[PDB]
Design a protein around this ligand. Structure first.
Ligand SMILES: [Zn+2]
Lengths: 208, 261, 150, 124
RNA sequence: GGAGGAAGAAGCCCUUCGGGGUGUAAACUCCUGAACCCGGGACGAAACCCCCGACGAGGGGACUGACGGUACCGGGGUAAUAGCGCCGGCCAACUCCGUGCCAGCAGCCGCGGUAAUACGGAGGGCGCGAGCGUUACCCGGAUUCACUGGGCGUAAAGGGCGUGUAGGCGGCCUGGGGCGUCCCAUGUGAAAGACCACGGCUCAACCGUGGGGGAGCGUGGGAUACGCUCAGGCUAGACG
RNA sequence: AUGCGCGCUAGGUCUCUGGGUCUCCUGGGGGCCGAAGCUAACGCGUUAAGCGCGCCGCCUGGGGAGUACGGCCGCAAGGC
């Protein structure tokens, strides 16, 4: 299961523009350009100084809600990252950025991660010429992520990937727009990502 | 914290001992004190019953202040100006607008064709480039067109987030609009002109032709007409729309309405 | 010009001839997140005056911290009164694992990765003083070599 | 002590003490109510607190607290006894699980329903 | 379910009567295609046996599937379950009515007598989510049995004082032994489990194949600084 | 209200008792101020509650309670 329901309310609560909706959250409608205060009856009141715990929780929540994965899955990924070599922050973000749904969103086949999840699940995506329908699949440096032949005639995919013309993909990825495919060069770095997140807070949270 | 930012805003608004000013949402009257000190007779449109005593107490030692218990949108400001500023030369507008009713306020003020000299407002940076931009700016849109048609506008001051007493969520930009004597381009069918502008920017990813044809009730009917008109006007629909300007829009509007209006 | 934090405001009272007279104490850390930390304690009849005095004291009492890779050169154990602080270096990617008072102090120091622990008494004032002293008692390789060899 | 003393005598381990003897290392117990009475708080509080004298399947007979707005406990009703101690009442160290055996879920609950066990109110 | 979707529908709640929230949330357009139907359909099973080789090594031919018409594949094709706890400080989450030390709440500090963010209910918010809470037990926090790592003047804690047995501990300079101690090699430290890496189930859980690591203890060799022991000597402790 | 033995770490002052070259140096004992240092503080500070070492005896929230019980010792009270 996941979180299904209102979304821009999370944009408001976090106080940042989390691009969770696709095209609306670019146009003057993201509900962060209007009412940038948290939701509810006591949204636009004076904010008290937040606790250390509050700050850490908010940072972790923001990071989790960007990728829209379970708290259990988030904890699992953190525990895996903390057990590996190198800086925990870098490794954790690398592991988060390797998810198949996220990779599809980065490639440009889908506009929102909530849409990439549906594309992957309903089966319109192959890795190394084999159908995979799980958003949580982890890709390694050097897999071909493509759209299935049976799914290339869809309006949705054509509109999505046609707009990628005159648009650049991330450095840690390569794309073939006319061939409708993509390549995972390597794991991304801290600076390759435009996250409004300081991972140090997330590290300090899961020590409590 | 607001100690000197207000003074800078008033300086940029360029008020003097003979200019009249309009205040919206005064609250306590942080800007109002400076305006009274520097400018001539002022006016306020407070609607909050709770903050009225505080505003009254703030403006007790001032004699050039008038307070109105009307909402800006509902009140016809033409009579307000003809009644209050009966001797003044230039009437400007200075206010800090409360997020939600910020675009409606500006639109209502501009659409009523006031004899205002101009406007200087403090709003969020978010919708600040959205109302002062250029072709291919990633912020070009309907709001930009409306503001840069009705008046001449450019962003002046960038107040960062870390200035206020309770830390807000968004950076702010004080914008100054010098009102324009005559509309930049002449359109007979102004309403459908505006709808055309909003149609070309219904979705910013699609091409202009597809935008125009897919956003009109008669769009299906006049596909050929739309195509021919965009072709003849030397500005084709094969572009996105964000790369156009006021001039191309004017020519295209003329093309549509001279032939189908 | 610097960043400030509020460890605690507390209200103390002394009895008088028919009544109580109150006073306020504030514990304030002033730092630049670069390796300069000051800690002040201010007493005043009013809260704002207490904060002002604490800020002034913290500015006038500053210590330079020898940070390498955003951490501490070596482990340290310092006892102030009944309270005791333990600081320990950590590899990059650990984060300041510490209680409220140390954390506050160390964040303004530019420390990014430390393992700490408080022992014995846990009076926040005494903990702050102990931590401050422990920071004051840090030497690097260069200083040690200079003292020993010359 | 000295290392020699530690070798000779050592350190005595601290043993825990049970707060719920009547349970006999079980999450719950099944008992029968014999007396249903209202009693008085310990010091600063004043109220009438419902208390049942329950005889358990253990070799024990103890007092248990009845939480909620209203109950239906007679002098025979089979009940479930749970851990937990009332701060005020001097001698009760057990609670009653609502809506289990003969005890019924308190009426018109809408907020905290898992406790005070009541079914979800159907709404059309 | 996904994308778009009002300066913002209706109802409900609050209101300084202007409005604010629930909220792009809904309704609404388009798109996908859990469930469901049709067809196909397994890996797990090649041996024993039989013919030619000797009754051997090779070679050649058949039989055998509970799971199970299941997994899975191909083709059609439907917008298609959300609950649970908490919102006084610990500790993330605030207002309006009801009640007036009553009904109650409670892990601690405590809250309940007329203006209750602490009880009851609504609106709203927060955390987790096919789950969420409660009770019981264990380790942590507990440096609160303190080897790592505590104390005993007044906070609990120096025996009423001597003499002394077992025990514990022990000054300097040499030489022998090599018991403790340290090092090298080797045997053992089973298979699972733990760590690393690489692989198989569409990922994971799960499983496979490798590689280490390991406290302890045997066997052989080596070192003698420090403890131990044997022999000689010295005068700074002690004794005369 | 401070177990014993040993070594180390400014001094000044008042006493009791020995030897010396007797202006004053040199042992031992009893007090008072105080360096460094210690202590929660009061305070201790070469007669340490400092810096260390060796051995012994005790402590682990307040009541219940030095109580009940069992044992040992006493003529008994009673004690451990
Ligand atoms: Zn948004």
């Amino acid at each position: 299961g996941r979180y299904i329901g209102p979304v821009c309310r999370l944009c408001r609560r976090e106080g940042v523009k989390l691009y969770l909706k696709g095209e609306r959250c670019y146009s003057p409608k993201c509900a962060m350009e209007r009412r940038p205060y948290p939701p509810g009856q006591h949204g636009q009141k004076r904010a008290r100084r937040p606790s250390d715990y509050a700050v850490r929780l908010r940072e972790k929540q923001k990071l989790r809600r960007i990728y829209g994965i379970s708290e259990r899955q988030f904890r699992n990924l953190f525990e895996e990252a903390s057990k590996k070599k190198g800086v925990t922050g870098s490794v954790f973000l690398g592991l988060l950025e390797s998810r198949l749904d996220n990779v599809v969103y980065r490639l440009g086949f889908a506009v929102s991660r909530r849409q990439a999840r549906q594309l992957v699940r309903h089966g319109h995506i192959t890795v190394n010429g084999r159908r995979v329908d799980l958003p949580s699949y982890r890709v390694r440096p050097g897999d071909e992520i493509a759209v299935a032949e049976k799914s290339r005639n869809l309006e949705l995919i054509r509109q999505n990937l046609e707009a990628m013309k005159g648009r650049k993909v991330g450095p840690w990825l390569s794309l073939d727009v006319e061939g409708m495919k993509g390549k995972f060069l390597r794991l991304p770095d801290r600076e390759d990502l435009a996250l409004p997140v300081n991972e140090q807070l997330v590290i300090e949270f899961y020590s409590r | 914290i607001d100690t000197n930012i207000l003074n800078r805003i008033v300086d940029h608004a360029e008020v003097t001992e003979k200019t009249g000013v309009i205040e919206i949402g005064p609250g306590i009257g942080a800007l109002t004190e400076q305006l009274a000190k520097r400018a001539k007779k002022v006016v306020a449109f407070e609607i909050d019953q709770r903050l009225l005593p505080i505003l009254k107490d703030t403006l007790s030692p001032y004699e050039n202040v008038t307070v109105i218990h009307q909402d800006v949108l509902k009140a016809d400001v033409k009579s307000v100006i003809e009644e209050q500023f009966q001797d003044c030369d230039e009437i400007m507008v200075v206010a800090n607008l409360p997020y939600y009713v910020t675009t409606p306020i500006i639109m209502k003020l501009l659409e009523e064709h006031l004899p205002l000299k101009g406007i200087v407002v403090m709003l969020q940076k978010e919708v600040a480039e959205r109302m002062a931009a250029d072709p291919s700016s990633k912020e070009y849109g309907s709001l930009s067109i409306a503001v840069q048609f009705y008046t001449e506008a450019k962003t002046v001051m960038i107040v960062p987030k870390t200035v206020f007493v309770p830390q807000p969520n968004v950076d702010s930009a004080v914008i100054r609009l010098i009102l324009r004597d005559g509309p930049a381009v002449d359109v007979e069918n102004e309403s459908f002109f505006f709808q055309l502008i909003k149609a070309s920017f219904a979705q910013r990813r699609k091409t202009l032709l597809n935008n125009l044809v897919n956003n009109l009730p008669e769009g299906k009917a006049q596909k050929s007409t739309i195509e021919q008109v965009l072709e003849e006007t030397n500005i084709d629909g094969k572009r996105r729309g964000e790369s156009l300007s006021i001039e191309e829009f004017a020519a295209l509007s003329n093309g549509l309405y001279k032939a189908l209006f | 010009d610097f960043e400030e934090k509020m460890i605690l405001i507390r209200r103390t009272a002394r009895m008088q001839a028919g009544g109580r007279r109150f006073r306020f104490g504030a514990l304030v850390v002033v730092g630049d997140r670069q390796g300069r930390v000051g800690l002040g304690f201010g007493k005043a009849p009013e809260v704002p005056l207490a904060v002002q005095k604490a800020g002034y004291y913290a500015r006038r009492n500053m210590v330079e911290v020898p940070l390498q890779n955003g951490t501490i050169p070596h482990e340290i154990e310092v006892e102030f009164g009944a309270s005791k602080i333990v600081l320990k270096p950590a590899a990059p990617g650990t984060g300041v694992i510490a209680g409220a008072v140390p954390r506050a102090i160390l964040e303004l120091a530019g420390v990014t990765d430390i393992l700490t622990k408080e022992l014995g008494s846990r009076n926040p004032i005494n903990i702050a003083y102990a931590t401050m002293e422990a920071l004051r008692q840090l030497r690097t390789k260069a200083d040690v070599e200079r003292l020993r060899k010359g | 002590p000295t290392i020699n003393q530690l070798v000779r005598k050592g350190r005595e381990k601290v043993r825990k003490k049970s707060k719920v003897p009547a349970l006999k290392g079980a999450p719950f117990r099944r008992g029968v109510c014999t007396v249903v009475r209202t009693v008085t708080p310990k010091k600063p509080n004043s109220a009438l607190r419902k208390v049942a004298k329950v005889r358990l399947t253990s070799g024990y007979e103890v007092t248990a607290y009845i939480p909620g707005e209203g109950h239906n406990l007679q002098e025979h009703s089979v009940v479930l006894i749970r851990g937990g101690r009332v701060k005020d009442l001097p001698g009760v160290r057990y609670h009653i699980v609502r809506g289990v055996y003969d005890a019924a879920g308190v009426k018109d609950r809408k907020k905290s329903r898992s406790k005070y066990g009541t079914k979800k109110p159907k709404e059309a």
